[PDB]
Curated annotation (Swiss-Prot), chain B:
Has 4 domains; the Pyr domain which binds the pyrimidine moiety of the thiamine pyrophosphate cofactor, the FAD-binding domain, the PP-binding domain which binds the pyrophosphate portion of thiamine pyrophosphate and the C-terminal membrane binding region, which includes the in vitro-derived alpha-peptide (residues 550-572). The C-terminus is held closely against the rest of the protein and covers the active site; during activation it detaches from the rest of the protein and folds into an amphipathic helix upon membrane binding. It comes from the Bacteria. One of its GO terms (molecular function) is identical protein binding. This is Pyruvate dehydrogenase [ubiquinone].
Length: 522, 524, 527
C-alpha cells in the first residue's frame, strides 16, 4: 500500500537515480511527500524549471545514467520545455515528471490548465498522461526504458490527484538494468565496405559523438587507410586528443584544414555524426555513413553506402578485413594544412594592451583549468572559442547546447555537472547574454554550494551573428549575491584572475571585458 | 537534366525497388502521375477508397519484406489513408505514404480541402514532414525511406501539389543503397547471466511473437534444450506453430485452455519478440524475462525481472551454447497433455451438421482444401478467432490480419495487396459480413485489377464479435454475380466441401457466401 | 441520481432534443448502447462504415438546424469518423462525436487498438477532450454541446469504455437550456460609415454566401436599393438563387461568364457571409467590404478595405434605413444582360441527343421532375458542377454537398442522413460512379434503414473531375442484387421516364445513367 507517486519514486530509486531537479508546487505534493519519507533521492531546487531541465541533461551526459526533472502543473512543467529540447537533442537519458491539474478539472479551462502530453511530443520519444493508477507500471516502465536505451527524453504527465491514489498492489518496483546490445553490420556488408575502401582514394573521416568509446579503433582505422579525421563539434571531446590524424573542424566555426580536407576528399566516411551544415559536405565524393540510428542516415548528405552499426564494434569487425594502404599524400597534405591553421588560431590568442581578445581568454582557461575539468559553453561566441581553443585529453569534458542551439545553457549545465561530480572542477564559459538570460539561477550556485567557476565573456553584446547590451558589471553582481567576483579589464590581469578563481575553495565569477572579434581566420 | 520534385521521388523509389503505388488520383497528384506515366516502371494501383490502398500496401510490405508505397490526394484523399496507415504502422511493415497537399500558397487560409496532414499522421508514423521547399526533398525522402525500412513502420511525406511540380535540386542523387538490418545481440555478460538464471529456474514457458520470425530452428532447439513449452501470440502463429513439438497454442480470450494454463502456471516466463497486450493473462508469481529489439516493448504489458535487447535469431544462437541441457520435463509433458485435450475440444466443434453451419467447421475445411502455400487474411471479428484456432500453418502459408490495430474490414483489402504482390499464389480472404460490407466498394477492385482472390464470407448476418449488432440479411453471392465475379451461396454444411473446392479451382476471383451460425467463444 | 457516465451523457442529449445517434457499435461502446437500450428514446442508426455515420449526422444537423450526434468504437471505430467530421466541421453544422476509447488503464502501453483520438480530432473540431475521470463529464459535455451548437461545428468527447461504466457525479444535472444565437450587429457608427461609403461608390456587386441564410428579404431589398447585381458562392446558392431578380450566377471554375465578369468588373465589392476561397476570382482594382460573424473569415481570401462583424439579417435591417436609394443602374443592367447570355449557353448544353447522354441534360431533367421541396445531395466531382449550374432552387428545396472539405463520396451518405431526418420528403442523391463506389457498402444501409433515397449515378465510368479510368460498371444490376430497384439508362430518350418512375416508386431506387465527358467552358452568346 503506497501512492502512485511513491511507486514512481521507489522505482527511480531502484534504477539508481540520485536526485530530481525542479521547483515545487501543490501539484507535486504526492511526489515531495514520497521523497521526504524515502530520504534517498535528493530534491534539487532551482530558480527556474528551465534550469532544472538543462541541469538534469548535464547530469545524464556526465554519468551516462538516467536523470530526472520535475515541474508543477501548467507553467511549472511548461518551464522545462526548452531544457528538455536540449536534453533530447543531446541524446541523454532524462525522465521528466510533469505534474498536471486535478484530473476532474481537465477540459474545463481550469486554473493553470495546459496539455503537457501534447506539448512535449516533439522533445521526447515517449510522452503520456497517467489518468489511472493502473497505468503507472506500464507507462513508467516504457518511459524509463526508452529514455535509457533510446537515449533521450521521456515524459510522464501526472495529475496531482492521481499521484495521491493507491498504486496497483502487484506492481513491482525493482529495475533490471539492461545495457545497450552489441550492434554490428552483417558480415557481407563489412566485406563490401572493405572492398570499397580498397579501391577508394583521398579518404577523410568525419567523426561525431557516436565515436565515443571507440578512440582506439578510430585512430587505428585512420592510420591503416591513411585518412585524416575531421570531427563534428560534439565529437571534439571524444576524438581530438592522442590523435595524429585529427585535422580540426569545418562549419563556420571550424577552420581551414577541416574545411579543405572535407571539401577535397574523394571518399568521405561519416562515423557517428549528425553534422548538419549541408553545404560543407563535398559535392562529388563517395559518401559512406555508419550510424546506429536509421534517422541519421542521409539526413544532411547523399549516401552512397549506408551501414547500421555501433562505431566501436563495427570498426573492430572491419579492421581485420581492411588492407593497409601505403598512399598517404592526402593525409600528409591535410596535416600540413592543419599546422598552418593552428598557427593562425594561435596568433589570434595573444595578450594586448588594447582589449582582451576572447581567444586569448579561452586559451588561458584551457591552460590553467584542471587536467580533468568539465567545461560548459554558452551558445554564442563562447562556443566558437571553446571549439577552437579548449585542449581535450580524454578526461576533460565539454558540454553545450550544440544541437538545440539555445542561449544561456552554460551555467545551468555547469550546475548539473558540479552536483554530479562534486570533487571535479567545472568551468562555465558564459556569454553576458546567456548568463543574464537565466541569471536567477546564479543564486542556485550559492544555495546548492556548488563551486562552479563562471567566466563571463563580457562583450556587452549579443555578439554571435549591432544589438547592444548595457555595460554590466557581473563581478559586482556576484559580490552582492555573496559569491567572489573578479573584474578583469586588462589582458595582463587574466592569468592571475583565472588562477585565483580556480584556487578559491568555492564558486567564483570572473567578469572579463572582451573585444568584439570576427569568425574567419586570415 | 531538369526534373520535378515528384519525378525525383518516383526515380528514387524506383531505385529502391518499389514496384507499385496504391491510391486514388486527384489534381494535387498531377506531378506524381505525370512522372509515373513518363517512367513506365512503377505501376499505379487504383483502389475505390484510399483506406484500402493503405491496407493493401501494408499487406504487400508484410509479404515482400520490402518498402511499399501508397498515396492520396489533398485533404480528404490522403485523409482516407489514415486507418490503413495505423494498421501498417502497428504491423511494423515498411510503408511510405505520399500525402499530396493543397497549393502551398493557400495554406493557413481555410482553403478548399485544407487539412494539416503533417499533424494528423504523427501517431501512425515514425516520420512525418511537410515539403515546403524543393530543397528539402533529398533529406526528407532519405530519412523517410530509411526509417520506414529499418525502423519497420510508416513514414509520411506531405507534398503540396505546386511544390511537386517545381524543379528538384540539381545535385540530388536518386540511387538508393539498400542497408540490411544490423546484427543485434546482447553483451556476452548478459547472456551468461541469462544462462545462469535459466540453470536455476523451473517450469519455464516461452511466450513467442512475430519477433521469432526467421528463428524457428533456434527457437525449437532452445525449447527442447530447457524443456519449455511454447505458447505463441497471434502474430507469432505463422512463424512458430508448425514443425514444433513444444507448441501448446495461445492464451487470451481467443486462445485455449492449454495456452491459458501453461502461461498461468509457469514459474519462469521468457517473452521472445512479443507485444502480447492482454495484461491479465500473464502469470502473477513468476520470474519474467523479456528479449526484444525494441526498448519500447520491454515491460509494456508485464513486469520484467530481466530484460535483454537483442534480435531473437542472433540472441538464441549466442545463448544456446551457454545453456545447459535440463533433464526435468514434467512441466512440458503436462502442457503437452493439456494441449492434446484442448485440440480435441477444438475439433469437436468443427463438425458438419444439418442444423446450421458451424463457422469452425467452415474454417477447418478452408484449411484442409486451401493450397500448401496459401496466403490467408482474416477480418477482425469471429474470422480472427477461427483463423487462430483452425488454420494449420507450415512455414509456407501466411496469415495477415489487423491484429494490433484491430480494425474491421481489413481482410479483403489485405487480400488485394497480397494477390498483387504474389500473382501466382492462392489468396483466401476470411471476411465478416460486417467487414466485407464496410469497404465493399473495393470488391470492384478485385475485378478491375483481375486479382483471383478467394473471398469466403462468414455470413452470420451480424456484427458477431460485438442494439446495433443485427445486419439485414444479405446475399453476397448475388452481389458478386452482379459485379461479374462468380458467387456461391452456401447454406447446408454438406455443400461446404464442394463449394470450397470449386472456388479454389476456378481460374478467377470467387466469393463464397456461407451462412454460419452464431457461436460461443469459450469451449467446453 | 445513481447512473453511469454513459447514461448521464445519453440523458443530457435526450434533454437537448437529440433524436438519433449514428455509428457502428463495439465493446468500447457498451455503456452507451446499454443506456440507449434502457432509455428507448434516442434511436441508434447503424451504418456500414463510421465515415458514413459522420456524413449522415452532418446532413441531419444541416437540415434540422439542431445538434446531431455520431459515435465510434475505440481505435479504428472512431478513427473512421474523421473524414466525415472534417466535412461537418467545415460545413459549420452542430455535431457531437462520441469517440469511445480503450480502457484507461491500458493507455500509453501500446495496447490493442490504441490511438489518441483527443489529438487526432483537434483540427476538425473546436472542442476535443479526453474524459479520464467521471467528475469531468458535466463540464466537458456542457462545453462540448454548447460550442457545437453556438459556434456551429464539431465537438469531440473521448470516452474510455471503463470510464463510461463508472458512476456519474451524483449532483450533476441533465436538463439542457437551449440558448439561441444572440443578435449581432455592428456599432451604429460603423453602419453610418458603411452607408456613407456606399453613397460614394459605383458599380457595386454583392458576393453572397450561406451567411445570408434567413436574410433573403433584406438581401434582395438591399441589392435593389443600391442597384447591385448579386453573385453567390456555391453554399449560398440554396439561400440566394430564387425570387431574386438581382442574381447573376456564380464565379470560380464551375461558375459562369455573368458571375465571372460581374465580379471581375465591379469597382466596389461587398462580401456578405461568404468564405468563397478562390483568390484569383476577386477583382484586383476594387474597394472590398466584408461583413461576417466570424473574425476568421475576414480577409481570408481577399484584401479588405472595410470590415464589419455582424449577422447579415440584423446588419442589413439596421443598414437599410441609412442607405440612400441609387438611381444609376447601368452596372446592374449590364450584369443582367450578361446573365441572360450565360443561361442561354447553359441551356444549349442540356439537350437530348442520340449520341450520348449529356450529364447537363440529365441534371436539368432531375431538376424538372424532382419534388418542389426535394432535398438534393451531390458528390464532389462533375455532379457538383451540374448541381450548381442546373438545379433550380426556390426557398424550399435544399442542396447539400462537401463543398468546403471537398470529399468524394459524400452524396449518398448525406442523402442517408437527410432521408432519416425528413422521412416524408423526397431526397435525390446525385452521385459519381467513383463517389458511389468509394463508400458503396452503405448502399446496404438504404435497404436496412428503409430510407427511400433516389440515387442517380452519373456513370461516366471515370474519375471525371480530376489513372482516372474505372472499369465499366452496371450499378443498376448491383442495386437489383441488393434488393433495391435499379434502372439502367443509356439513351437520352429514356431519361424522362426513368426519373419519373424512380420518383414515383414507393421505395429507394438507383438510376444508373451512362453519361458523356464534358467541359466547364460555355461558348459566348452573340455580341
Ligand atoms: C553557435 C554554434 C555554431 C556551431 N557551428 C558548428 C560548426 O561550425 N561546425 C561543427 O562541427 N559544429 C557546429 N555546431 C555544432 C553542430 O550544430 C552540431 O551540434 C554538431 O556539429 C554535431 O556533432 P555530432 O555529429 O557529434 O552530433 P551528435 O548530435 O552528437 O551526433 C551523434 C550521432 O552519432 C550517432 N551515434 C550515437 N552513438 C552511436 C554509436 N554508438 N555508434 C554509431 N553511431 C552512434 C547518432 O545516431 C548521431 O547520428 C555549432 C553549434 C553552435 C551552438
Ligand atoms: C479480435 C481479436 C482478438 C484477439 N485476441 C487475441 C488473443 O486472445 N490472444 C492473442 O495472442 N492475440 C489476440 N489478438 C491479437 C493481439 O492483439 C496481438 O495482435 C498479438 O497478441 C501480438 O502478437 P505479437 O506479440 O507477435 O505482436 P507483434 O506486434 O508482431 O510483436 C512483435 C514484437 O517483436 C519485436 N521484434 C520484432 N523483430 C524482432 C527481432 N528480429 N528480434 C527480436 N524482437 C523482435 C517487436 O519489437 C515487438 O515487440 C487478437 C486480435 C484480434 C483482432
Ligand atoms: C468540385 C468543387 C468545385 C467547386 N468550385 C466552386 C466554384 O467554382 N465556385 C464556387 O462558388 N464554389 C465552388 N466550390 C465550393 C467552394 O469550395 C466553397 O465551399 C464555396 O464557394 C463557399 O461558399 P460560402 O461562402 O457560402 O461558404 P460557407 O463555408 O457556407 O461560408 C459561410 C460564411 O458566412 C459566415 N456566416 C455564417 N453565418 C453568418 C451570419 N448569420 N451572418 C454573417 N455571416 C455568417 C461564416 O462565418 C462564413 O464566412 C466548389 C466545390 C467543389 C466540391
Ligand atoms: C534563447 C535564444 N535566443 C536567441 C538566440 C539567437 N542567438 C544566438 S547567439 C546569440 C547571442 C548570444 O549572446 P551572448 O550570450 O552574450 O554570447 P556572445 O555571442 O555575445 O558571446 C543570440 C541572440 C538563441 N540561440 N537562443
Ligand atoms: C472499424 C471498426 N468498427 C468497429 C469495431 C468494433 N467491432 C469489432 S468486431 C465487430 C463486429 C464484426 O462484424 P463482422 O465483420 O461481421 O465479423 P463477425 O460478425 O463475424 O464477428 C465490431 C463492430 C472495430 N474493431 N473496427
Ligand atoms: C476522398 C477523395 N479522394 C480523391 C479526391 C480527388 N478527386 C476529386 S474529384 C475526383 C473524381 C470523382 O469521381 P466521380 O465520383 O466518379 O465523379 P466524376 O467522375 O463525375 O467527376 C477525385 C478522384 C477527393 N476530392 N476526395
Ligand atoms: Mg555577449
Ligand atoms: Mg458477421
Ligand atoms: Mg465519374
Amino acid at each position: 500500500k503506497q501512492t502512485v507517486a511513491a511507486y514512481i519514486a521507489k522505482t527511480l530509486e531502484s534504477a539508481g537515480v540520485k536526485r530530481i531537479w525542479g521547483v515545487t508546487g501543490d501539484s507535486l505534493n504526492g511526489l515531495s511527500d514520497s521523497l521526504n519519507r524515502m530520504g534517498t533521492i535528493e530534491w534539487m531546487s532551482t530558480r527556474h524549471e528551465e534550469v532544472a531541465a538543462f541541469a538534469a541533461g548535464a547530469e545524464a551526459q556526465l554519468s551516462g545514467e538516467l536523470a530526472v526533472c520535475a515541474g508543477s502543473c501548467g507553467p511549472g512543467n511548461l518551464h522545462l520545455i526548452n531544457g528538455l529540447f536540449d536534453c533530447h537533442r543531446n541524446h541523454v537519458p532524462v525522465l521528466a515528471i510533469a505534474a498536471h491539474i486535478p484530473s476532474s478539472e481537465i477540459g474545463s479551462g481550469y486554473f493553470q490548465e495546459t496539455h503537457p502530453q501534447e506539448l512535449f511530443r516533439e522533445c521526447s520519444h515517449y510522452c503520456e498522461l497517467v489518468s489511472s493508477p493502473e497505468q503507472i507500471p506500464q507507462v513508467l516502465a516504457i518511459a524509463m526504458r526508452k529514455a535509457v536505451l533510446n537515449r533521450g527524453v521521456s515524459v510522464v504527465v501526472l495529475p496531482g490527484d492521481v499521484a495521491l491514489k493507491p498504486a496497483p498492489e502487484g506492481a513491482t518496483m525493482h529495475w533490471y538494468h539492461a545495457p545497450q546490445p552489441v550492434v554490428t553490420p552483417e558480415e557481407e556488408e563489412l566485406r563490401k565496405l572493405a572492398q570499397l575502401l580498397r579501391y577508394s582514394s583521398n579518404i577523410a573521416l568525419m567523426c561525431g559523438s557516436g565515436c565515443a568509446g571507440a578512440h582506439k579503433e578510430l585512430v587505428e582505422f585512420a592510420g591503416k587507410i591513411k585518412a585524416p579525421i575531421v570531427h563534428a563539434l560534439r565529437g571534439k571531446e571524444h576524438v581530438e586528443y592522442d590523435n595524429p590524424y585529427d585535422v580540426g573542424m569545418t562549419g563556420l566555426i571550424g577552420f581551414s584544414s577541416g574545411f579543405h580536407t572535407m571539401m577535397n576528399a574523394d571518399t568521405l566516411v561519416l562515423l557517428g555524426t549528425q553534422f548538419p551544415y549541408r553545404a560543407f559536405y563535398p559535392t562529388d565524393a563517395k559518401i559512406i555513413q555508419i550510424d546506429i540510428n536509421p534517422a541519421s542516415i542521409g539526413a544532411h548528405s547523399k549516401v552512397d553506402m549506408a551501414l547500421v552499426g555501433d562505431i566501436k564494434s563495427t570498426l573492430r569487425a572491419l579492421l581485420p578485413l581492411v588492407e593497409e594502404k601505403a598512399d598517404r599524400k592526402f593525409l600528409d597534405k591535410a596535416l600540413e594544412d592543419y599546422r598552418d591553421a593552428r598557427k593562425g588560431l594561435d596568433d589570434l590568442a595573444k595578450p594586448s594592451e588594447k582589449a582582451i581578445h576572447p581567444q586569448y581568454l579561452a586559451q588561458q582557461i584551457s591552460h590553467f583549468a584542471a587536467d580533468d575539468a568539465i567545461f560548459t559553453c554558452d551558445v554564442g561566441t563562447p562556443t566558437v572559442w571553446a571549439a577552437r581553443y579548449l585542449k581535450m585529453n580524454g578526461k576533460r569534458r565539454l558540454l553545450g547546447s550544440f544541437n538545440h542551439g539555445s542561449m544561456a545553457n552554460a551555467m545551468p549545465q555547469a550546475l548539473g555537472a558540479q552536483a554530479t561530480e562534486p570533487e571535479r572542477q567545472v568551468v562555465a564559459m558564459c556569454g553576458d547574454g546567456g548568463f543574464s538570460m537565466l541569471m536567477g539561477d546564479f543564486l542556485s550556485v550559492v544555495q546548492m554550494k556548488l563551486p562552479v567557476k563562471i567566466v563571463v565573456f563580457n562583450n556587452s553584446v549579443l555578439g554571435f551573428v549591432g544589438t547592444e547590451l548595457h555595460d554590466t558589471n557581473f563581478a559586482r553582481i556576484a559580490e552582492a549575491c555573496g559569491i567572489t567576483g573578479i573584474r578583469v579589464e586588462k589582458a595582463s590581469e587574466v592569468d592571475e584572475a583565472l588562477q585565483r578563481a580556480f584556487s578559491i575553495d568555492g564558486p567564483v565569477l570572473v567578469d572579463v571585458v572582451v573585444a568584439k572579434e570576427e569568425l574567419a581566420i586570415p
